Amino acid sequence: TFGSGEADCGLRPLFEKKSLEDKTERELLESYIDGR
Amino acid sequence: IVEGSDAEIGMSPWQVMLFRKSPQELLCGASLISDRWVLTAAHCLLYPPWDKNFTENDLLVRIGKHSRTRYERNIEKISMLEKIYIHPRYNWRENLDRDIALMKLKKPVAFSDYIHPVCLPDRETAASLLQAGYKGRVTGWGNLKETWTANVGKGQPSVLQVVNLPIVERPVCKDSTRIRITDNMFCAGYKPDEGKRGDACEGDSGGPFVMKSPFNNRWYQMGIVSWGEGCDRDGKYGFYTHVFRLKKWIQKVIDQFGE
Numbered sequence A: 001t002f003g004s005g006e007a008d009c010g011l012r013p014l015f016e017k018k019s020l021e022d023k024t025e026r027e028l029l030e031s032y033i034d035g036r
Numbered sequence B: 001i002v003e004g005s006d007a008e009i010g011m012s013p014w015q016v017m018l019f020r021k022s023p024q025e026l027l028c029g030a031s032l033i034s035d036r037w038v039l040t041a042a043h044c045l046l047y048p049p050w051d052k053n054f055t056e057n058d059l060l061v062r063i064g065k066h067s068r069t070r071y072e073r074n075i076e077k078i079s080m081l082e083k084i085y086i087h088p089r090y091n092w093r094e095n096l097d098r099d100i101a102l103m104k105l106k107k108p109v110a111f112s113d114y115i116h117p118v119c120l121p122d123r124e125t126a127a128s129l130l131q132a133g134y135k136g137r138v139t140g141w142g143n144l145k146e147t148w149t150a151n152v153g154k155g156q157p158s159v160l161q162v163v164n165l166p167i168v169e170r171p172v173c174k175d176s177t178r179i180r181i182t183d184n185m186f187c188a189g190y191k192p193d194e195g196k197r198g199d200a201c202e203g204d205s206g207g208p209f210v211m212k213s214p215f216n217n218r219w220y221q222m223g224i225v226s227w228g229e230g231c232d233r234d235g236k237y238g239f240y241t242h243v244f245r246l247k248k249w250i251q252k253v254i255d256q257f258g259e
């Protein structure tokens, strides 16, 4: 099956876990199609 | 990384430093995809042209690092390797096609605030999100400039460096170079008329190109730093191994054996 432990992958302890944004993170979001 | 900036602590908890034993040398970046599996570029390990052939025990993997050079005492984890698997159709002779290798760690790492796996993309997420103009992020400890030729500035960062750049469309990728481009490669970077700059560079290979899904909000690794021609040159683009096109092989070696 998996070789793994991960499955909470891509959520980052000091940031999404803590409901925090990194300092240049809204930029990539802003490219996805544009914003709003 | 050229034209990037210092990383916040914990912002790339998947970043992995591939580190040579003797002589102590940074060689490449990598990424944590699981507590036992690390993904990188195959050319970091095997590139016969430059007489390059690392085996499982020429290398350390350092996980949870921020500083390029200091031991971070209760943050970083130094691990040793069990197995290296390089794509059997990796083409080192011509264009670096299928620039991917897996590393099975010898025992598992435990996740902390500093150490946390990235997701690999599924069909719908690779489709959704990898469209020209969409931005991703590259991290590494690699060159700040081109150091093979005389240049001003430090060549080497003290802290992990972050750059956020756009996917460029294949037409443009293919005419910025005379190296043969492939479906397993994408390019990314700013056009000369876009005002902004930045790129990977030598030392950055193996590091992830990641993207934050607006749906669930999980970061996914979309590419691996592969090749380029200089660093940040106008009209040139960084080329990246296309992780989703190679996920069949990843899955097939990861799941091969049980735990």
Ligand SMILES: *C[C@@](*)(O)[C@H](CCCNC(N)=[NH2+])NC(=O)[C@@H]1CCCN1C(=O)[C@H](N)Cc1ccccc1
Pocket (backbone or CB within 6 Å): B028, B041, B043, B044, B047, B094, B095, B096, B179, B199, B200, B201, B202, B203, B204, B205, B206, B225, B226, B227, B228, B229, B230, B231, B232, B237, B238, B239
């Ligand atoms: C191994 C990696 O550190 C490195 C990353 C360079 C990224 N550069 C930019 N601007 N984004 N890759 C390499 O240096 C590879 C390995 C072999 C040499 N090489 C090159 O990128 C050459 N610059 C171009 C090349 C030569 C032969 C075959 C393919 C590409």
